[PDB]
Amino acid sequence: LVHVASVEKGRSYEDFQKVYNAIALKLREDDEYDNYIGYGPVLVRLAWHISGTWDKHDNTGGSYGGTYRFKKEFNDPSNAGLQNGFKFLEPIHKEFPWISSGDLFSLGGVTAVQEMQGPKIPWRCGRVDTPEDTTPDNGRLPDADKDAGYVRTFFQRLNMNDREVVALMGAHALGKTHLKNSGYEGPWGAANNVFTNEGYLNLLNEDWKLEKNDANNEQWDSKSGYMMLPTDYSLIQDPKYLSIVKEYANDQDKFFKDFSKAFEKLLENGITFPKDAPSPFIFKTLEEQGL
Numbered sequence: 620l621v622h623v624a625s626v627e628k629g630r631s632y633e634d635f636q637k638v639y640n641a642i643a644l645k646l647r648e649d650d651e652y653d654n655y656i657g658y659g660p661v662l663v664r665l666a667w668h669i670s671g672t673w674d675k676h677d678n679t680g681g682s683y684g685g686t687y688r689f690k691k692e693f694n695d696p697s698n699a700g701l702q703n704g705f706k707f708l709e710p711i712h713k714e715f716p717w718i719s720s721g722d723l724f725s726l727g728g729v730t731a732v733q734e735m736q737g738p739k740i741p742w743r744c745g746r747v748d749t750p751e752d753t754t755p756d757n758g759r760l761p762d763a764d765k766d767a768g769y770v771r772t773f774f775q776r777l778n779m780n781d782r783e784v785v786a787l788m789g790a791h792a793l794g795k796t797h798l799k800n801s802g803y804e805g806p807w808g809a810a811n812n813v814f815t816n817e818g819y820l821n822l823l824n825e826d827w828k829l830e831k832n833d834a835n836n837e838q839w840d841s842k843s844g845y846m847m848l849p850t851d852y853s854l855i856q857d858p859k860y861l862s863i864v865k866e867y868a869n870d871q872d873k874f875f876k877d878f879s880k881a882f883e884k885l886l887e888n889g890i891t892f893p894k895d896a897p898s899p900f901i902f903k904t905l906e907e908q909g910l
């Protein structure tokens with residue numbers, strides 16, 4: 620399969636910056652969701668779930684086609700809870716009907732990271748909506764109850780190496796797990812809508828205890844009220860992953876730089892960009908614009 624990026628007709632930087640500002644302004648306005656965590660964390664989870672179906676072997680899945688609008692994908696049990704992020708985006712799409720679904724779902728993720736004071740993420744336009752029979756089947760997204768060997772093997776399918784996987788996993792400092800969505804309960808840290816390396820710091824410094832939650836699943840719990848999934852705790856069990864966790868716990872800037880590259884790569888996997896396509900855009904935050 621070859622998916623070639625095609626810029627929405629006649630659009631440029633200024634057009635996509637208006638759609639960024641529309642999302643950022645509504646993120647500020649709708650601050651009450653999920654006991655005042657707001658919508659930022661479920662929007663970067665949605666951008667990762669629409670990209671995380673990709674398979675490097677035959678180029679199916681990925682962000683390009685925006686197939687999450689179709690029932691088979693929207694109803695995947697792995698996507699429980701992301702309907703909240705899709706309904707947040709629906710008024711923005713009605714206001715800007717020219718943007719493709721893939722571009723809006725990935726730009727929602729870039730916007731949230733930047734507005735939660737994370738790194739700038741360069742983003743490229745041009746995903747094109749494809750037909751319902753191109754919707755990937757359920758079951759391509761990862762399980763939470765596994766170990767380090769599983770995480771490593773799983774992410775090889777998305778062409779991600781150990782540094783990229785540990786950097787990507789730093790996004791679990793955002794938001795929280797919800798018992799009715801995944802069968803796990805609790806936050807990973809104290810700062811759940813500010814982008815930071817606190818996940819790595821908690822993993823190395825908290826006293827964790829393996830307990831069973833109300834959905835009868837095991838998870839690691841700390842005396843401070845934080846939790847870690849089996850797949851998160853993995854990162855300190857494996858020797859290769861633990862050296863990178865220690866590097867990011869001691870250098871916030873290197874974590875920001877490595878996340879930015881790996882999150883842009885995630886969102887662009889499977890897409891061919893023509894050599895005459897525009898450069899990646901870097902959008903300004905509302906704060907840098909004084910809005």
Ligand code: HEM
Pocket residue numbers: 660661663664667699700761762763770787788790791793794795796797798800801802803848850882
């Ligand atoms: C082996 C890899 C991963 C697994 C098993 C996993 C698992 C989970 C689970 C079980 C939840 C809870 C969902 C809920 O109950 O609402 C969650 C939430 C979340 N995940 Fe992951 N995840 C993985 C990788 C990632 C990556 C690569 C990113 C982002 C780059 C990410 C970002 C998030 C965010 C921000 C949330 C918070 C959602 C919210 O607060 O509503 N995850 N993850």
